[PDB]
Each structure stands twice: as structure tokens, then as C-alpha cells.
From Swiss-Prot, chain A:
It comes from Bos taurus. This is Insulin B chain. The gene is INS. It comes from the Eukaryota.
UniProtKB/Swiss-Prot annotation, chain B:
The lineage of its organism: Eukaryota, Metazoa, Chordata, Craniata, Vertebrata. Disulfide bonds join 6-11. The chain holds residues 85 to 105 of 105 of the full protein. It comes from Bos taurus (Bovine). This is Insulin A chain.
Length: 30, 21
């Protein structure tokens, strides 16, 4: 489900599910 | 950056996983 164009809330939701308990950083600005 | 690699182009598990802590 990750090999697609993931934008906005869709991308943060993928990070939330793949990363789990680990957490992640979302830096759009870059 | 992530938007460029996963929004503007197709993402991968490798890329997402680089943003996990
Ligand atoms: Na890409």
C-alpha cells in the first residue's frame, strides 16, 4: 500500500502505520 | 524530501522507513 503517490494526510497515515511505536518525523518543508 | 519522494513521485517502504524514529 506504500508504493503509490502518498500525499498530505495520506502520507502521514502511512508513516503512522509503518513506523508503529517507533514514531516518525514529518517534515514537508524541505 | 518526503513530499518530493512520496507525493510527487511514488514512495517506497525504504523511503517511509527513513522517517521513523
Ligand atoms: Na519517489
Amino acid at each position: 500500500f506504500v508504493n503509490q503517490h502518498l500525499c498530505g494526510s495520506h502520507l502521514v497515515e502511512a508513516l503512522y502505520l509503518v513506523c508503529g511505536e517507533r514514531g516518525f518525523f514529518y517534515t514537508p518543508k524541505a | 524530501g518526503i513530499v518530493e519522494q512520496c507525493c510527487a513521485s511514488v514512495c517506497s517502504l525504504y523511503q517511509l522507513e527513513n522517517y521513523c524514529n
